[PDB]
Amino acid sequence: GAMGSMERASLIQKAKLAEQAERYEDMAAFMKGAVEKGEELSCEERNLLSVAYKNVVGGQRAAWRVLSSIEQKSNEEKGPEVREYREKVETELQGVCDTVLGLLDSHLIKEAGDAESRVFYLKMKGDYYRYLAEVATGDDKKRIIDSARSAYQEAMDISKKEMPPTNPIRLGLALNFSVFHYEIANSPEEAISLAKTTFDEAMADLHTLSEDSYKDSTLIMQLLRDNLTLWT
C-alpha cells in the first residue's frame, strides 16, 4: 500500500503520465493503488489497468522465453546459472500475475454488475491464469489451465448474452480464448473454430456500426484473421 496516501484522481493522472513516458511498472503501481481505493473502475480506468500490466508481464514473458530457449539448448554446457536466472524471472512473472489475480478477486469481479465490466475482468482473469500456465510444470499445472478456461468460459457466456458480436471486449476475449486453446490447451481445432465463428459473426454485424466503432471492431478482426493465417 505504498500508494495509500495518494488521491485516487492523482493516481489515475499519474498512470496516464507514466503511459506517455513508457514507464509501465510505474503505471501498474499507480493503477494498483487506484484499484485499492475500493471504488469501481470506469471503462477508461479498466483499460489503463490492463494496458499497464500487459506491458509489465509482456516484458517478463519475452525474457522468460529467451532464457527458456537458452536453458533447453544448454540441456541438449554446464552450471546452474541459466536455470537460476530463468527461475528468478519466472518467480517475478508469477508474482505479477498473482498481484493482478488478487486485484480481480479483491474485489473487482464481485462488484462488477454490468456486462462490459464483468466480461472485461473475467477476460483478464483468464489472461493472467494463461500467463501462469505458460510457465507451469508442477502439481497445479492442470488446475491453472482449468482456472483460465473457466474464467474465459464465464466471460464468453455473458458476452454472448449481453453484447453484440462486434463489441471490442467480446472480440478481444474471443481472440485471447482462441490463443488459449491453441497454445495452452493443445486444442488447435477449437482455436480455429472459435476464431472463424467470431470473425464471421462480427462481419455480419458491422453494418450497424458508426465509422469509429467500425474501426475499433475491424482492428481486432484483423488479429483474428492474422492468427487464422498462421494456424491454417
Partner: peptide, 7 residues
C-alpha cells in the same frame, strides 16, 4: 510468428 492477443 507468435499469436496475436489483446489487453
Amino acid at each position: 510468428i507468435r499469436c496475436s492477443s489483446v489487453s
